[PDB]
């Protein structure tokens with residue numbers, strides 16, 4: 001699996017432009033870690049009835065991940081600065097990856113999966129992913145939810161493993177792998 005950066009590639013830039021706009025819900029071109037964390041805890045974790053240890057763990061991983069791309073409490077971030085912090089984040093993540101250090105996306109994924117299956121298999125139902133796709137808004141369609149489960153190497157119960165999603169995410173967000181292309185269907189270019 002690919003480890004080199006492709007930050008100058010217009011396809012990588014467009015992918016995170018889509019996600020920035022998605023985070024810029026009010027359309028003014030600025031986002032804050034304050035909004036992101038609110039979305040994580042007050043909107044996603046509260047709705048899923050996660051435990052305080054689980055909510056704190058999820059919020060800790062979200063804070064770390066977006067501080068990794070230069071966000072911070074009280075700071076308004078516009079897309080050029082977001083994009084430049086994403087080069088730094090992806091470079092950090094590939095370095096930790098190449099040393100078998102837990103990546104920030106690995107740690108966030110563990111925290112998300114721990115909500116749906118509690119502590120155990122670390123696998124999620126489509127019903128459970130559809131729920132996540134709608135709550136987080138990253139994939140509010142019940143149709144797009146279906147295509148990701150068809151794109152991923154699933155297991156024998158028709159359930160998705162955070163091991164699988166983490167591998168797909170390192171391709172989909174960091175290095176632009178074509179078998180990571182399609183991870184979120186046509187819902188994220």
Ligand SMILES: O=C1N2C(=N[C@@]1(Cc1ccc(O)cc1)OO)C(Cc1ccccc1)=Nc1c2ccc2cc(O)ccc12
Nearest residue numbers: 016019020036039040105108109112136138162165166173
């Ligand atoms: O990976 C996941 N993301 C997201 N929820 C995730 C969570 C997840 C699921 C399974 C895993 O194994 C690992 C993580 O579901 O995909 C949200 C949704 C979200 C944003 C803020 C606060 C709460 C939620 N935003 C982005 C993103 C990934 C890269 C981004 C790159 C960008 O420029 C921008 C956004 C994301």
Ligand SMILES: [Ca+2]
Nearest residue numbers: 024028029030
């Ligand atoms: Ca905004």
